Every structure is written in C-alpha cells, then in structure tokens.
RNA sequence: UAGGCCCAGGCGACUGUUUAGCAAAAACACAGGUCUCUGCGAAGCCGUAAGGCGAAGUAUAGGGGCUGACGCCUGCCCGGUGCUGGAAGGUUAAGAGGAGCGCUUAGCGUAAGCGAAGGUGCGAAUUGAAGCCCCAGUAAACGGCGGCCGUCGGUCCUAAGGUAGCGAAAUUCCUUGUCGGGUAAGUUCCGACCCGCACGAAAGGCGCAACGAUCUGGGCACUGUCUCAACGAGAGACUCGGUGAAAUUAUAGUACCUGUGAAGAUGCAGGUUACCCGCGACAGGACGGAAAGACCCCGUGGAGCUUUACUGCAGCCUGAUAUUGAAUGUUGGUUUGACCUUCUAACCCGCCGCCCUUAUCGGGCGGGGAGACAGUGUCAGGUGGGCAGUUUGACUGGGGCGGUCGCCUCCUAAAAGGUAACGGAGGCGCCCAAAGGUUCCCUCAGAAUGGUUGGAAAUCAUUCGCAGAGUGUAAAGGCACAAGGGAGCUUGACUGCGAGACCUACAAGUCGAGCAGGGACGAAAGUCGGGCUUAGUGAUCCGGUGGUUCCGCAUGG
RNA sequence: AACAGUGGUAGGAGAGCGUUCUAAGGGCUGUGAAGCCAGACCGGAAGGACUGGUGGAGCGCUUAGAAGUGAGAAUGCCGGUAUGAGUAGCGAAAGAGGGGUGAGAAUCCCCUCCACCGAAUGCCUAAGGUUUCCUGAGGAAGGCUCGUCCGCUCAGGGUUAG
RNA sequence: UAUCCUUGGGAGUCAGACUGCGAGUGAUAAGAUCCGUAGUCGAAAGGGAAACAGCCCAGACCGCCAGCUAAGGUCCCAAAG
RNA sequence: UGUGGGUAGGGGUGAAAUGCCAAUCGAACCUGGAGAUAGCUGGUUCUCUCCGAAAUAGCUUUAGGGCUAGCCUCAAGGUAAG
RNA sequence: GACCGAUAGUGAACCAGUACCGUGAGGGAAAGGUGAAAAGCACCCCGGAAGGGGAGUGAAAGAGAUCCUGAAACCGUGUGCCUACAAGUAGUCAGAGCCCGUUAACGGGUGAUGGCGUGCCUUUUGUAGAAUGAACCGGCGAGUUACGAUCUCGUGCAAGGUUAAGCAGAAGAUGCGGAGCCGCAGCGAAAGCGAGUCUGAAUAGGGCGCAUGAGUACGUGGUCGUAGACCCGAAACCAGGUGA
RNA sequence: UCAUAGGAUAUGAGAAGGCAGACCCGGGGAACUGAAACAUCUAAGUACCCGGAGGAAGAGAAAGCAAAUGCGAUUCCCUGA
C-alpha cells in the first residue's frame, strides 16, 4: 500500500500464461558424470540411486 | 467579514533542468550530454553533436573545453587524448 | 497459516537468477498514436524493479 | 374564607388536548365546509398466508387529503408535474420463432481444399402487453399569478400575469416610515396613508359577539416595586453538649507593585510590606469545583430525515406459460396454431338446504352462481423514498459560498540547478500530406523620391537600410553561413535496435552517436528515425479489430 | 602504554542488574529459613552484602534454560486511609412538671396540665407486605443523639366460619 | 584532514520556532505568512542579557575549597579599577 | 379513577410534541456476534554505554495519516575514492 | 505438569450463580489460615456489661477467636535539636552552635544564617506553566504466542542437505520411514533451447544469466505477514429473546 | 342405497419431554468489519434460530481417478500448494 497512490502492480500490466503440459526436465551438467566408472551404463534410475 | 477571490495567476510549468551538465577539463564518455538548452545559447564544436531538443552531446570520449565563436557566441568541444 | 502470495504481482512479475524482478512497462496498452515509435520500441521491452519498490513488496513474493 | 375592575387591539371561534422531568401557546383537535376514492369477499389497513378490523355496517355509509364555528366571499391560469379518460401511430421485454452463420466429421480428395447427415453454439425476419411518446379534461389537485418606454397609452414575454378584501401587519430591510391620538416626554400601542424590500382569497381572504392562567398597550383603585430604607416575630446561621458526612485534593512554611514569561504569575526578577495561631463575615483571584465543549473545525466516524442522488427490495399494474378442456365459426402458412362467441366437468363462492354436529370453523352430499376467466407457482417489463444499504472530494491565512485542481512559457528565483504562497502575466487539450525530408536557390519590416484608377496605406522601380520583419500557435531562448522565404523530386512523419548520458522517490519522461535492413534527395561528400526547440495528453483492469513456424486439460480440431 | 574522545529527544546497536520456575552440582537452616524493621557497609548503575531485632519453616550460591519477568501516572481496577472538619446536616408540627424504674434518664413508663388533627393525622377495608401482632428477657448493631425503649435481637405464644 | 561508496537488517521523521541576511503577499505592519541561506532551539545544560527556549560567549564522563580567559563587567546590592 | 385484559421494537401508541413505550427513545432493554472498528486521544514498568535525526521533496478523496526518496544506526565488503 | 497459589487460579478454595441489583430476560460480588493438640483462659480484682490487669495452660498469649507474619498510607504518646521581624517547588551547597557516638570513616541527628534554585508525566515550535493526569499508600495492570517468510549469528553436513505424516518407543529421547521440499542452470509469455537463451531477418547489437559457485536442516535474536496481535476506550450495526 | 366419513370399545415398555454451553446432518440465515470510502466481493454459509439424530454422525463399493505395458469402496493424516 502507498496511501491511495495507484500501487506498482496495478499500474503495471499482466503478461503471459502458464502451460498445463510443461516439462521441467531434471538437468545434469555433464561434470557430475565424471564421478562414475568408465564404460558403465547410466540411467535416471541409477542417478536417483 | 467580506468575501473575495479570483486571482487567476496561480500556475507555472515544471522546471526543466537546463544548463551545463559537464564541466571544462572533465573527462567524458561517448554519447554523454553536456548542455541542455533551448535553441542555441551554445553551439557544438569538434566531436560534438546537436539533437532535436537543441541539446549537446559528445560523439566520442575525451575532455571538454568551452570557447567562443569569435565574438559574442560560444562553443563547446571534445578533444581526446 | 502459510503466507498468502500476492497473485496480481505474481501474474505481473517474474523472478531472476540474481534475485532481481523482471517487469514490463506501462503506457503500453491502448493509446499509441500519442507516442513516438521510439517510446514504443523502448516500452515493449522489459525492465527491472527498483530498489525502493523491491523493499516495499518482496515479502509478497517469497513463495514466488 | 370567599371576584379587583375598566378601555382598546392582535391570534385562535368556543369547552377541550400537548413536549411525564424547561415550552400551555397563536400549536393539535373540534363541530362545520370541500375534494377524492369505494358496488361490498367493498375500498383502505394488519398479516408470508390463512384469518381479521372496516362492519355483525352498505354511498344520507366507510376510508383518505386540505381547511377550520358563524357571516360575506373564495378571482386568472390545465403551459409544466400529477391524477382521469382516450389512444389511430411510433417505441419497448420475456416468450414463441427459427432464414442464415460458425465448429465438428463420414466421404471426396495428389495437395491446397471442399465437404452430406447428425450433434453443438450463435441466431435474422416476423409476432409480442402494460408503460412511455402523443391528445383532451381537471386547480377547495401539485402549483403559479410578469416586465420595459412615454406624459392613461405603446410595446416584450407569459399558460396566466394578483380580482375583491386587507395592508409598515405575528409578513415592511430601508425605518423610531409620515400624520394624528394618547403622554411633559411614547423606537412600544391605537387609527389612518400606501411605491405591499417579500399580503391575498380553503398553506383559505376580510370581519366577528362570546371565550382565553394567550400576547400587547392605556386607565381607576391599591400597595415598601421604588424614592430610601427602619423595626419586630419565627426557622437556620452563632455558642455549648451528643452524633457526624461530602464534593475536591501533585506536595506546600501559599503577601503585593511593576516587569518578564506559552504574550493575563502566589510560587520567576527587582523593589515594597508583613510578629505567631485562630473565630465570625464577604466572595476579587486561585484562568475555582462539577460535566474528556453541546458552538466551530477535522474524522475517507455514526444515526435520523428528504429527494427528479446511485443501486436494489417489497407492494401494485401488465404479459407469456402450467394448472386448463368441449365445441361453432373466422382468418394465416403449413394439419396447424391465433382470435371472437358458446358450453361444462376442472378451479372458485365471506350464497342456500341436509348430515357430520348441541358449532356463523371445515367437509361430505345436493342445488345455485360464476367459469378455463380468476387465483396460485415460474419467468419477464413498467411503476415504485413505501422500505433498505450507501455516496455526497480536497486546497482554503477557521469553515462555508466563491475560485482552483493536469500540462507549457516568463518573472518572483537571490548570476549552476532547484525553490513556496488563493504571488504576478499568459497559453494547451492542436495544426501541416505540406507548414515534413532532401537538393538548389535568396533575404526581410519600414522610410524618402517619382509615378493613372492608387487613395495615408495596394502593386511599382528607386537608394537607405543586422534585422525594427518573419519564425503555424502563448511566452522565453534562438536563428539572416539560416532554423526565415521560393522552386524541383519525394515520403526517414521508416523497421529492428542502441553504447552511453540527463532528469528522477517510483512510475515515467528526455537526448543519443553508431550497426543492420531496405529506401528518398543529391554527381559526390553527405542529410533524413517529423516539424526552430519547449505544451498539444493518462495508468492498469476490461473489452473490441488485425496478424501470428505459441499453448490448447486423453488424442485431432 | 600513548593519543584522541565521552550533552542528547525520536531512534539503532551493545553490555549487564534483578524477579519466578526448572535441571544438575554443591550447600544453609529449630544452635533459628524465607518474609518484615532498622542501621553511619560494598559496588560505576540497575543493585548486593553484614550485624541486630521481629518471625517460627523453609531458602540461597554456581552454570545453563524457560518466562504471566521489573510500574509513578491510563478522569486506570480493587481495597484501605486521609483532607475538607468536629465543619454542613441531624428530614415540616408544643411541650412542661412531678413521681417511678434503673448502674446510668431531656429522650423509657405512670399522673397532671397545656397544645395539634378532627371529609382528618379519626374508624373500617383492598392491593401489597409476610410475624412486623402479644408477652417476657437484652441493648453489640440499626434508631441521623441518648436509651432502661421498638416496626431491632432472642425465646415462647397467637390467626378457630354451612 | 578522514570520511566516502556499495549491499543488506532495523528505524523514526513529513505540526517546526526565532534570530541575521536576500525576496514575495501585506500597509516594505505584525512575536504575521510563505520561500532561500547561515545559526541556535528543538534534541543543549553552563556564564551574560534583571528575570527571559531561539540574542552574545561557550558545549557538561566524574571529582578537587587550584589556575588562565571569552562574552559581560569592576561605588554598594554583587567578585573585580 | 380502580380492577381485569390487548397492542412489542425494521414495531406499537400517539387531539402530533418526534412525544410515550418501567427514572431511557430521531428508533427501548438483556444476551450473543464481539477483545466490533477507531488513520483518534491517553497509557506502555530496570540500569549503563556507543552513535545520533527529522519537522523536507514527490504522489496521495490527501493534507494532524501513509509510501518511496532524503536525514540516523548496525554489520560485511571496496578500500582511500571523500 | 520448567500450570495458579487467595486482587492469582473456575465467577465461586469459605453453604455461590449465594447475597445483592433489576418488573423481566439478565447481571453478579465480597469473604482462606488459632494451636501439634482446646490444653480455649478455673480463680482473683476493676467494671452494669463490653473490655481490661493478674494468675494458669501452652514452646510461645506480644497466639486469646480478623486466631501465622503483619509493611505503607493514616492515627497518636514521649523526647534530643530548631522555631513567634519573617515571605520563597520547601531542597542543595557553605556553615556556627547544640546533642550523640558508627558496618570507625575526612562519623551521625538537628540545623541560626548566607548563596543558587519556578515540581513529575504527557503533548507541544515552545509548558513552572493560568494546557492535561494523578488525594495518598499498597496490590493488579500494556508489544506476547502459534504458523509461515526474510536477515544476521551459531552448529552440523556440504554439490548435497533434509525428512513430514505414520509404526515401535515411559506423553520422551531414539530407530525406521526418502513420499516430498530447497539448492546445484538459466532464458523465454510459451513451444522450446541450454551456459546459454529471448528479441530479432541477423554469425550484429542489447536484456537476463554463466564464467567471478554454497547451499541446506535446526536453534537464538531482529523485523514482517495472517490471526483480538502493545493495552484500555466509542457512538453505533445485525441476530435472538424480555418487557404495556 | 350399498357404502364411506365420523363415532364407540380393547390392546401397545409406541412418542411426547429433557440434555453436555461439545462433537454432525440438514432447513433458514445477519451485520459489524476488511476492501484504508462503497454497492460486486469479504466477514461467512460464521454467529444465531429451527428440526433430526448416534456414540459417533455423515460419506461409501465406481455411469470414478486417470491417460500407464493402470488404480481398483469410503473416511482421515502428511504432502501436492
């Protein structure tokens, strides 16, 4: 509140929307893989483990 | 008691903050403005440009110097290193 | 009771990696013939909340 | 112990009633008058409804409004608002309607795309009551009854312009109006006059005997009301005995002169004065006590009240539909619905008779009356201060009324910038498709001379002429190497942007080289992202339009 | 050690004092706890000891912890007591005397006079009150004083219907 | 000469007054009002101005029965010619 | 005038004053919602130390309120710009 | 029970929803403590009694029926010093005389006389203020709690931190429980891409980001938010009832 | 007129009413307040009234969740948020 001054959010506009079918994939950044042994397979199951 | 009024002289415009904004011998960046004005109290010179608002800006970096166009007429200029 | 998020500001702002708040400009809704294209190209772009306003409001957006 | 009386006036006819606890009245009521409504299940009113008052009445009655005995009277306006009635025509709902339009899709399809049926959504014409618009009437309905010029006339406007009667009034500011009466002296009173600031005919006008703890003026008598106080009696007061509170209270060994000081000192300064303690008395001060000022202001406080403030509700009116069907006709396009008549069995009867039942309830039967109406439910329109919830700005040399509320320019402004006042002066809410861009061109106003019409002043040549002119517009700044004035070609009055700066609480606002794309003018350099700069405009939400390699709730749309 | 500094409202920061309770550990206390009253003690402050007296059974110290954690003011709430002040008032109205009672009498009882009411201050009786009625004891409170007295306190008793 | 900038936490303040100077409104009146500027008060005791928020001098940790000074003063109230 | 009854609050009654409705009435009283709300006033309890303001701007159905900025404080950094 | 301990805590520790108030609904108190045990005061006197003084009981009678302690306001008695020519927010500093003799130290109580000096709180530009509040004493009496967020500090573990509900477990600690949450990668409206991304025609520029990396769980503290949210305080509004 | 209404009689541990100021199921259903006014909105389907209960009530065995080589009644708790 600002004492009857039109506050910031109202004087500003809305923008955009949200998707229902959004995918926020879990991200690995390729250096965390160096912790694994050579030639070993990799799976999300394994990573959760 | 009496009753009076009607001054009708009770307004003025918003003050616009003219004048110089940088000083002689002061280092300046490109695009910096130097002297807000209306019309030409001052002209541009070297490496200086005028805008649609009759305002003066530096086209380059350098140092400011104010001078005179011979008689009764002033100038600015930017000189680099 | 969990804090309630301020939904209008949620609809209007977005959070950044540096904690700053992205925003849009005003004067960009309906009345454009009375404005220069310079203004308009400047105003379709985004902006950032100022420090004072941020101090005012940031508690309303802890939950984003 | 049991009237004081008289003269005159205003108001109200009277007797009565009223603000318990400030106001007894000129207020209310009154009988009388008038208007209006209402045909009896009256009307009105209470209630969600049943049920009731009205009324165990029936238009010589009942309800409501206004006025107020009585006497003489109650003038002109129906233009506006109301009511009443009409109502050819226009407009207007819901409901009915159902031309078309979308979406989807089987299928056709190389593709693009088209695409039947069905479903779904939107839906035009047409119809559609009251009401409103419109026309008459009505003033003891709301309400209204003027001005100018001339020395009765002429004129403007009115819907109509105040009749009678009364009149410095309970209305008259000027005003103690003028005159007269009354008085030595009368802003009062009475009677007359009328240039009635701003009487007036049922908000009744004028008068009026009787009446009034009414208001007012004058007079006789009487009086300590007074001149001007004196005395006496009694109850308190005072003393003694017995009993024994309260309000208030920062602590106090609490003087006055002047001065100071939050501008009125006990308490501060200086000076003066004053032995200590009490009793009776007074009430000048302690801005004394009492009551968080009832006036004034403020509060985005409240409550009550009004209304042609807003939004709604009840109630009322009207229509569609269901209860709610049987016919005879009628007109329409496709049988169908609509309309007028008729019938009855629905429904209804605060109509009768019988039984339940010794019952003015109801409820069954029989009749009778009305009748698919009404009533009720749902939906819709209108009316609707009857009722409810709410709003009804700020600044302000108190408030209110006035004025202003945003933007631009100048002064005030104090030689950066900035800087207030209900301080001083002025402008804007645009304009130009050329008044823009570019290239090229040249230079103004006025003055003196000469010269038809030409004229002081057009147009003319003429020398003088920084600028006295112009610059779309207000002013300031600025510009004559043009930013001023002409001509040609054009649309950069472009798209994406933007280093970096200004101003700034924020929001925002301002300038900007330079890059890319595509161009305009120009040979070229090169200029052009509107105008000579500064005003010429407003958020967000909400909707609308167009475009879109975005999303589209199982999938495709 | 040296140098410099140390007024302060709103307000920010930091250091601490003290109260209640809890845990642990170490203690005091009938040879006298807490609490209360005095005292000329100690500490920079909040504050803390010591001695004596009263009292007559529970309480400190240390480190930590947790809080209904500190009052001079709200025309604050409750209670108590003051001031005013032995002041105002002691609530319309004729009493006086003699006897008596009694510890004690203006005030109670008896007598005599006087005075007031008398369409009322008299007799009946409703509503209402609910033992106030009668008798005998009492005078702590109430009685606007006193009180030997009563519409007060105790006991007892008392209200009879075709 | 040491305070400056940034970020972050926490505030309070938005009734100001007088004095001197420069201005306005006013009547070149106001202990007026409104602005700018410097100071003091506010939030600052002490000495003087008799007293006396805002004037002059000057800034308080505490003590001392020491001294030098400012403003202002030196016949007595009242220290000093 | 008595007795017995009736009318009850968004209401009743009213020879009307806005008067009366249990010492009240421009909308009774009790309870509850309810610790209503109060940009308003009053009050807000131990000490010492360090530092130390503002009474201004802008916007405000805003003017005795609020928000941001300005002015204060604390801490960590930059550090030496001031 | 890191709940109260008689103004608290139930309104109510006691014959309380009583007394009392109100027509009524309804409102609504106050008031604890002998002693281990009545052993509760035989008897003598004063007195009409009450109430005392002795005696006696008892550890205690200064314990005696409001009965443990028993403060202060207030009320009085006695007395050391001062006081009846003095004006004073009542004290302070200086100081004589007089009287005493300590938690034994440049001590104590009074104080003639001199100097200086207009109370406290609030609210104010400014108050001794003739602005407000308090008669006084005593007690009670106002920024807290839950949940969540954020900052700081601390601890633990660290590109990994952490469990919740729940089960077992003395109302516990603990173990199990990894479902979930925060962070490690951001940008974009979104599809989506990815240390890049968005805009854009653009390998351009620009924004946001990375490269310049530390979070997370818990606790203390500060602040905020939602809840009566520092305390008291309205006029008033609504619902349901009581009253002619 | 059957016949019915209505009436008469006998049986019924019927049901009535109360509550514990709490829990729940429903029918009715405020305002203050907040929105810094205010009507939409909130407060709040709260308070309050009413009727029904039971020791629990209510819901409850899919015309579902959903979108995988699928889960299989309700209820409640933690999360999701």
From Swiss-Prot, chain A:
Q: What is this protein called?
A: Large ribosomal subunit protein uL15
Full-protein positions shown: 50 to 98 of 146
Chain ranges passing through the membrane: none
Per the record, the similarity remark reads:
Belongs to the universal ribosomal protein uL15 family.
Function field: Binds to the 23S rRNA.
Q: Which domain of life is it from?
A: Bacteria
Q: How does it assemble?
A: Part of the 50S ribosomal subunit.
Curated annotation (Swiss-Prot), chain B:
The reply to whether Membrane figures as a keyword in the UniProt entry is no
Keywords in alphabetical order: Ribonucleoprotein, Ribosomal protein
Q: List, in alphabetical order, the GO biological process terms annotated in this UniProt record.
A: translation
Q: How is it modified after translation?
A: The N-terminus is cleaved by ribosomal processing cysteine protease Prp.
Give the protein's biological function.
Plays a role in sporulation at high temperatures.
Checking HAMAP family in the record gives: Ribosomal_bL27
Q: Which family does it belong to?
A: Belongs to the bacterial ribosomal protein bL27 family.
Give the record's subunit note: Part of the 50S ribosomal subunit.
What is the protein name stated in its UniProt record? Large ribosomal subunit protein bL27
Swiss-Prot record, chain C:
Residue numbers spanned by region Disordered: 1-47
Q: Which GO terms describe its molecular function?
A: structural constituent of ribosome
Q: Name one GO cellular component term.
A: cytosolic large ribosomal subunit
Q: Which UniProt keywords apply?
A: Ribonucleoprotein, Ribosomal protein
Output the PROSITE patterns linked to this UniProt entry.
RIBOSOMAL_L35 (PS00936)
Q: Which GO terms describe its biological process?
A: translation
> InterPro entries attached here?
Ribosomal_bL35, Ribosomal_bL35-like, Ribosomal_bL35_CS, Ribosomal_bL35_sf
Q: Name one Pfam family in it.
A: Ribosomal_L35p
Point to the regions of Basic residues compositional bias: 1-25
Superkingdom as given in the UniProt entry: Bacteria
Subunit structure as annotated in this protein's UniProt entry: Part of the 50S ribosomal subunit.
Spell out the family assignment given in the record's similarity comment. Belongs to the bacterial ribosomal protein bL35 family.
Q: What is this protein called?
A: Large ribosomal subunit protein bL35
Q: Look up and give the organism this protein is from.
A: Bacillus subtilis (strain 168)
Q: Which lineage is the organism of this entry classified under, starting from the top rank?
A: Bacteria, Bacillati, Bacillota, Bacilli, Bacillales
- The record's gene field reads rpmI
């Amino acid at each position: 509140f600002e004492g009857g001054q039109m506050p910031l959010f109202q004087r500003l506009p809305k923008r955009g929307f949200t998707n229902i079918n959004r995918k926020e994939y879990a991200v690995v950044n390729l250096d965390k893989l160096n912790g694994f042994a050579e030639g070993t397979e990799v799976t999300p199951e394994l990573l959760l483990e | 008691k009496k009753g009076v009024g009607s001054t009708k002289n009770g307004r003025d415009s918003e003050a616009k903050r003219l004048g110089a904004k940088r000083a002689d011998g002061q280092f300046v960046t490109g695009g910096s403005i130097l002297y807000r004005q209306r019309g030409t109290k001052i002209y541009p010179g070297e490496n200086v440009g005028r805008g649609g608002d009759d305002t003066l800006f530096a086209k380059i970096d350098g140092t400011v110097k104010f001078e005179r166009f011979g008689r009764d007429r002033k100038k600015v200029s930017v000189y680099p290193v | 009771p969990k804090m309630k998020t301020h939904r209008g500001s949620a609809k209007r702002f977005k959070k950044t990696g540096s904690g700053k708040l992205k925003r849009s400009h005003a004067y960009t809704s309906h009345l454009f013939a009375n404005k220069s294209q310079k203004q308009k190209r400047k105003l379709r772009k985004s902006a950032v909340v100022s420090a004072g306003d941020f101090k005012r409001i940031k508690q309303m957006l802890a939950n984003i």
